[PDB]
């Protein structure tokens, strides 16, 4: 169960010293990554997020206005052009505020939920880099929610359900939630921090969530929540973060018209659910040890002939499955059928369709699974509908 | 017909002096962009491309090994970390060679088609920047084909059909093709350049393509083809490029085992069909003057009530359409029905469903189009199937 070894074994990705901490996503690893995006998007639709894309670098003077420059300038890559210094973005937050600031906002536009699969780069020490887990370039399932003070409970609610709904899809049902203890140096009124804390307290009670407090210092900009999942090995992984923010929107001159016709500053809620998706993919690789569920499997079906007689039939099938939206490949090589079956089993391909002479005469296929289960000869349309149901439901298990 | 004005009008994107030449993609502009990706992917599947994602910067020493450093170092952004200099990638080609170089390749793996929606950055002079057309950061529908010498005709064929098939989807059927005149300084044998030229000549004849020659100097690395489309204003736009390459693969130590069991260098074919997609989107915006075809429209349907009686019904409809895969929005505001209809017309929303009292009692909706056409009251399921057909077929015109 080593995601770097399995990654090489299944041709998912690679890295090289030329781009330390930066992932070369091969076709099959990119297939997994994009199937995560579709999943995230399907929940974005459900909970009504926008999806945006911001620029990959922005003026240094802007980053200095966030206040992150002072604290974290050592972690940001910098480049210049025409005697102007830019920073490769390490976070998507300022960009989203930039999009919010276009056009006059009123209370009726809030809550405004803005999501981005944003690529960010940090200048991590090369010695801390480890596979997909600790990298320099990553994409996170980022989002930022702009809302009034009164909306914090309802919004945090939505983040909480989102965390548990998504993690369960992967088979993660053991989840620890840690609140944060407020620092002595913080931004925002004492009054502002205690109403928000009541909103957080009421939201956690509502979802019946036992929370611990985090023993270290919290964030200076607002209350913060972290979610930790446990995998089948009972290992703890911290992925979800919900970070209330009373500092960035005032610093970047965000405002909206309230019902009282007054320019208030909106509250910002930063939230990721999976965290870094490169990291998350590593986690899934170890969780399943390379036996990806059908919907995540890079290749879902391989169809094989026994001799060249059945070769035309297989190509028919491969196209027929591919029009049905199944990642399928035809294996017409000059190897014997046991060799093909063992080989595609070692490569963790979920289903394997064998086409002997009786299969062609019959309009069916012999089905073997990557666990060695023999499901017998089944109608072609039957295999298609069953496979589609498993894909769309994102079943963790097979037939 | 100004894509920058329409872009502001339809809330597609924006730019600011903080990130010159770099696009802030708002929700609705990002919806168009992602609907282009899906379209490109659907043709990737048809012509069997891989899709990969490479790292966003790589060691300077690598870029020096391509030979592009000397010619074009002024156009590449540079940054460093730990006394090592990196370049923000201005092209995806070296990265794809890196993925190809993992693992032993033999003739049986070629042609190997590798596609990427790769973000690239060039340090263009700030005075040349213009809207979406001339930018510093762009994504192109990039691909690279690794193939034997004998495969050039069949591969170039595939690029040609790809160009015409894709352009026609948008209503571009006037297309000029320009071959290139070979430079005096070039890389590769005299023999190598003349067999490839026969492959190009035979492929162009096969598709009945009248070609001109480009009056300037060609590329030093291989024969090159450019495709120009003409829009409804008879303006010429150059988007497609097919660039044969005999220099990069030898320079980056790519090789494969031939049938003769000899390590040959593969031929590289670089091809983009739309070019920069930010640029291409600008082109479509002017081509349609903001009346995007339904499949590209950011919001495809708006459903409206006439008073709050019909308000519950509209919300039912909006969800029903949204489960059918339609980008739909409900307009329950306290404005009169003509105001809503004019407003969503000015925003070029294709279809508009009005729900009066008779509509709720009947299980139908009144349909008006953004051209002012009154299609009458229709069954709800009827509107759904018709809309789905227009979307999946990517019809340039409405009902
Ligand atoms: C404040 O921005 C706080 N943000 C987060 O913790 C956060 C979590 C999940 C999703 C999003 O979008 C978030 O912003 C934190 O201070 C952000 C931050 C931490 C570290 C660095 N760094 O370069 O080491 C930059 C920003
Ligand atoms: C050689 O790489 C040649 N490539 C292309 O013209 C090309 C066209 C379409 C798609 C792809 O992937 C291509 O590589 C050209 O020399 C590449 C190149 C041109 C300009 C710059 N620049 O930074 O000004 C860099 C690379
Ligand atoms: Zn954030
Ligand atoms: Zn290229």
TrEMBL record, chains A, B:
The keyword Protein biosynthesis applies. GO terms for molecular function: ATP binding; metal ion binding; threonine-tRNA ligase activity; tRNA binding. Zn(2+) binds at residues 93, 144, 270. It catalyses: tRNA(Thr) + L-threonine + ATP = L-threonyl-tRNA(Thr) + AMP + diphosphate + H(+). GO terms for biological process: threonyl-tRNA aminoacylation. Keywords: Acetylation, Aminoacyl-tRNA synthetase, ATP-binding, Cytoplasm, Ligase, Metal-binding, Nucleotide-binding, Protein biosynthesis, RNA-binding, tRNA-binding, Zinc. Its cofactor is Zn(2+). The modification N6-acetyllysine is found at residue 45. Residues 2-293 are annotated as: Catalytic. Its EC number is 6.1.1.3. Binds 1 zinc ion per subunit. Its main location: cytoplasm. One of its GO terms (cellular component) is cytosol. The keyword Metal-binding applies. It is found in: Cytoplasm. Coiled coil: none annotated. It is an enzyme of class 6 (ligase). Residues 2-293 form the Aminoacyl-transfer RNA synthetases class-II family profile domain. It comes from the Bacteria. Homodimer. Belongs to the class-II aminoacyl-tRNA synthetase family. This is Threonine--tRNA ligase. The chain holds residues 242 to 640 of 642 of the full protein.
């Amino acid at each position: 169960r080593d995601h770097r070894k399995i990654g090489k074994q299944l041709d998912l990705y690679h890295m090289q010293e030329e781009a330390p901490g930066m992932v070369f996503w091969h076709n099959d690893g990119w297939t997994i990554f994009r199937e995560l995006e579709v999943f995230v998007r399907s929940k974005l639709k459900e909970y009504q997020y926008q999806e945006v894309k911001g620029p990959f670098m922005m003026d240094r003077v802007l980053w200095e206005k966030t206040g992150h420059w002072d604290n974290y300038k050592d972690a940001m890559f910098t480049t210049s052009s025409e005697n102007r210094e830019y920073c490769i973005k390490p976070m998507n937050c300022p960009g989203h505020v930039q999009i919010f600031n276009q056009g006059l906002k009123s209370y009726r536009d809030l809550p405004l939920r803005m999501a981005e699969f944003g690529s960010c780069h940090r200048n991590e020490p090369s010695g801390s880099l480890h596979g997909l887990m600790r990298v320099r370039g990553f994409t996170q399932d980022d989002a930022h929610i702009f809302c009034t003070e009164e909306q914090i409970r309802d919004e945090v609610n939505g983040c909480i359900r989102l965390v548990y709904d998504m993690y369960s899809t992967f088979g993660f049902e053991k989840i620890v939630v840690k609140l944060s203890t407020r620092p002595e140096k913080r931004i925002g009124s004492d009054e502002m921090w205690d109403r928000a804390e009541a909103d957080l307290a009421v939201a956690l009670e509502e979802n019946n969530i036992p929370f611990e407090y985090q023993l270290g210092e919290g964030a200076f900009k607002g209350p913060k929540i972290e979610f930790t999942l446990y995998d089948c090995l009972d290992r703890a992984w911290q992925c979800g973060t919900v970070q209330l923010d009373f500092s960035l929107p005032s610093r970047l001159s965000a405002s909206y018209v309230g019902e009282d016709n007054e320019r208030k500053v909106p509250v910002m809620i930063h939230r990721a659910i999976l965290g870094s998706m490169e990291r998350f993919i590593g986690i899934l690789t170890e969780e399943f040890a390379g036996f990806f569920p059908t919907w995540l499997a890079p290749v879902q079906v391989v169809i094989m002939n026994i001799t060249d007689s059945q070769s035309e039939y297989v190509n028919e099938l491969t196209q027929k499955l591919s029009n049905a939206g199944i990642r399928v490949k035809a294996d017409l090589r000059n190897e014997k059928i046991g060799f093909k079956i063992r080989e595609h089993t070692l490569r963790r391909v979920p289903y394997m369709l064998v086409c002997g002479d009786k299969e062609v005469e019959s309009g069916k296929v012999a089905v073997r699974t990557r666990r060695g289960k023999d499901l017998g000869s089944m109608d072609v349309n039957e295999v298609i509908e069953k496979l589609q149901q498993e894909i769309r439901s994102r079943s963790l298990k097979q037939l």
